[PDB]
Design a protein around this nucleic acid. Sequence first.
RNA 1: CGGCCCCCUGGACGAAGACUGACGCUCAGGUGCGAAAGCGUGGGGAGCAAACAGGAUUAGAUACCCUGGUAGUCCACGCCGUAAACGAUGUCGACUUGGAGGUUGUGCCCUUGAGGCGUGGCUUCCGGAGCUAACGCGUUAAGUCGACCGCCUGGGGAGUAC
Lengths: 88, 129, 66, 259, 70, 225
Amino acid sequence: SLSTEATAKIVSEFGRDANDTGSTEVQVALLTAQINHLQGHFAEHKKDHHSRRGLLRMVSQRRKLLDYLKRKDVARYTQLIERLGLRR
Amino acid sequence: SMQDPIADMLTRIRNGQAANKAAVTMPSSKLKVAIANVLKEEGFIEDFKVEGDTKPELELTLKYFQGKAVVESIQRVSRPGLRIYKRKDELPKVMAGLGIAVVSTSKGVMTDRAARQAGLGGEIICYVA
Amino acid sequence: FCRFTAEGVQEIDYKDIATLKNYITESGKIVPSRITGTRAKYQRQLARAIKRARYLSLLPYTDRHQ
Amino acid sequence: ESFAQLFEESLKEIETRPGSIVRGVVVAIDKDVVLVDAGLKSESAIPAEQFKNAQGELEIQVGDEVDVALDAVEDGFGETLLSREKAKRHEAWITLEKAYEDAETVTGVINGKVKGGFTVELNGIRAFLPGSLVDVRPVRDTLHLEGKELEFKVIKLDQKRNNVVVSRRAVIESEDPWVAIAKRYPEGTKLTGRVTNLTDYGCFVEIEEGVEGLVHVSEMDWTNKNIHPSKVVNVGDVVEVMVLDIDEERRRISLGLKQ
Amino acid sequence: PVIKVRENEPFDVALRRFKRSCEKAGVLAEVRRREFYEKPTTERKRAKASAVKRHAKKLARENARRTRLY
Amino acid sequence: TVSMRDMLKAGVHFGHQTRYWNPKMKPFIFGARNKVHIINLEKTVPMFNEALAELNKIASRKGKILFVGTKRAASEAVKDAALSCDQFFVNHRWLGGMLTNWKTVRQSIKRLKDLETQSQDGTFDKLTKKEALMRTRELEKLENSLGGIKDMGGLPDALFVIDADHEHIAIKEANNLGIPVFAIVDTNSDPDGVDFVIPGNDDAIRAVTLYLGAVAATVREGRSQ
RNA sequence: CGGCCCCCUGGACGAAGACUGACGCUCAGGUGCGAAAGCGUGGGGAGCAAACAGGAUUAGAUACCCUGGUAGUCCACGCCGUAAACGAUGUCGACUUGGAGGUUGUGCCCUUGAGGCGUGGCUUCCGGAGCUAACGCGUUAAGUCGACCGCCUGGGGAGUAC
């Protein structure tokens, strides 16, 4: 998983409240951090299909959050992707 | 997931009548409620009561005559996978009319015979018998 | 009537030999969950602790070996 | 009304689960079945052998009141665990009474040790005690007139498993089972144990504080195979048994009865 | 099952105890199960059938026990 | 006629273990303290009274009454009660289709009566011993079975029963013939067959005796009418 | 999928609370995993064992039995994609009498004891209504309802031929 303190950080940066924890942008970036962390493991271990499944689940949940965010509001979407450096 | 609450209501009524439950309860809705109005108005039920502010809870009180249930049968006719609209001239009869068929029309919800009298068709929600 | 449950121990110590010894066969097997009277949850901890001690030679695997 | 609700909690208040409240009136006697009614769902099928006192004949006619026991309820139609155990609690209370003044006095008469402690019998029941308890010193009641009259002064009791060794003569003088299973061990320590259920291969006498003994079918008597243990001993009765074998590991203490 | 004759211990008692000990260990039977290979399926089958039988005896026989024979 | 305190004393309120109940008895149940169902006497008593009224009403029109019970613990009481108001009973086991297959049972009554006539009025002794034992064996069997009813002549005008679940055969038979049915119904039993159901304690002795005595007095009252 | 340890890691459940606010179900095409056997290549090779040799039996015995026994079975990376891959029971959601269990939580209770009363999840058995051609299924349905997909149209020829 992700370290708790890492989550607390990501929250501080992206949550408008730092107690909210449920902001779409927040959840996006949490997923993003987790994907980033998991990239190295799967680079090393190319055959752990099992966990690779949950990884992909994270990716999808991220994408869906992004779709929701796109429709709801575009400026927020754009800044978020900028911050995360996500291509789309 | 829940796809039709009208269906859920009819099933719950069916099962309460089946099980000899005095009353039955479920989430409340406007259409649900006007249906309960109707059924009372046609004396298949003793009374309904909606309760709650936020997610209010409708409660029908069932009816038993000489022991056996009073809604002999209740069955939906329209449904989300297949809706059922009729013209006034096309209004069925339930049980050769010994029953009723709930219908929505532009002038609210009401049984088939009241609709005939009014002179206007609509959506046949369900037969009751 | 599980001793670990009324004593209320949190965990079972492989280091504590003799309380284990209470639960072992003169041959060194582990005595039967369904026939012993120790609760299941504590039971598995007991088996784990026995195994550990065995590895450490504190306990024998069996009576015979040497 | 709430008359009935209040009456229910009232009737809860005026009964308890064990054989404590002497309530069942004997409402039919026939050999060999007594029957009471202690305010339970059904009447007990009582044996006659929980009610004859010390020489074999009955003591209680119609209307008489003994409590029985409980905590076991209905496989179909019937009620209670026998009232004789009831009696055990009374015996326990008298034994406990000692603690108050540090001396329980009755009569104890102990001729010999089945397993290292003279046997003492109080009223109807007879109990077994560890070897020291019978005599205060090294006096030994073997030279005393047989089955002599003293009292019992307590030497030792095991507090969980019920073994009590008591003090004859000398009036002037005044987890848990199978951790240290070496007390009744050494080869042949005789015990007094009530049998529980006879499983057509066995008899299951088991008394000494949460253990299990068998006395299976081979000994039981001095005939081997044609015996059928239900014919030969009893149901629910305290008998002659000793260990012959303990495995403290696969908790099978294998007692015997041919001794 | 290791055993030692106690001092002044009858031989036949010693042997009886030797038997009791081997019996406690359940060793003969363990040899019996390890003479020939059993298939996992069949192992399962034996065990589950036994447990099925077990429930049968405990419950249906008691229910029968409730009724008197004659 | 009967009073609630008397029933309480009789332990009518007691019922069967709460793993042996029939949901059809919930309405007649009050609660279940001690893992044993209690019978609402508040609900019971009016119904017992109604049944007593109807029984008296029958006995007034010269109604035949049958007392069913074979628990083997109260057989004596049921029989004595039957005798009290002089009605009919079956204090031992239920014959399959006694009522439904009455006619054949009537032939059987007649055989029994002939054997009785032989035993007492015949005074004809000098019969071979073995045949003697056989006639007497038959007499004893037939008197155990068919004693009370022998003089019923026809079918009965109503049916009183002690344990409906143990006597469901009789109950089904009255239903098929439609004889009125008056059953002491415990928790674990079923009411559906019963025209007039009595929520009470089949099992207990004293309660049964109480039921029986009240019934017998009401029949004697109807007969006096 | 089962000896013991370490390292990476997936899910489920229960407790209270906090948050979003319909974001959901299903799914042709499509992608992915996919027993055992088997193939490729490179290692490995105790046991066992197709094939194979012998010895038996038998009319005969290319078997069953006995003695040997090679590929394989194991390890690394690939392919293969099929099974009685079975609950011969597609997925999601709701509702409907009971019992006895097991396993795993968790609330409360003098735990006065291995206990008393509840509340969650998964799970074995029996059985009521109901359903069923019967067998049986039966709150884990094969009952009563909704949504989407999937498949069936006499036997063979044929799950074959092109």
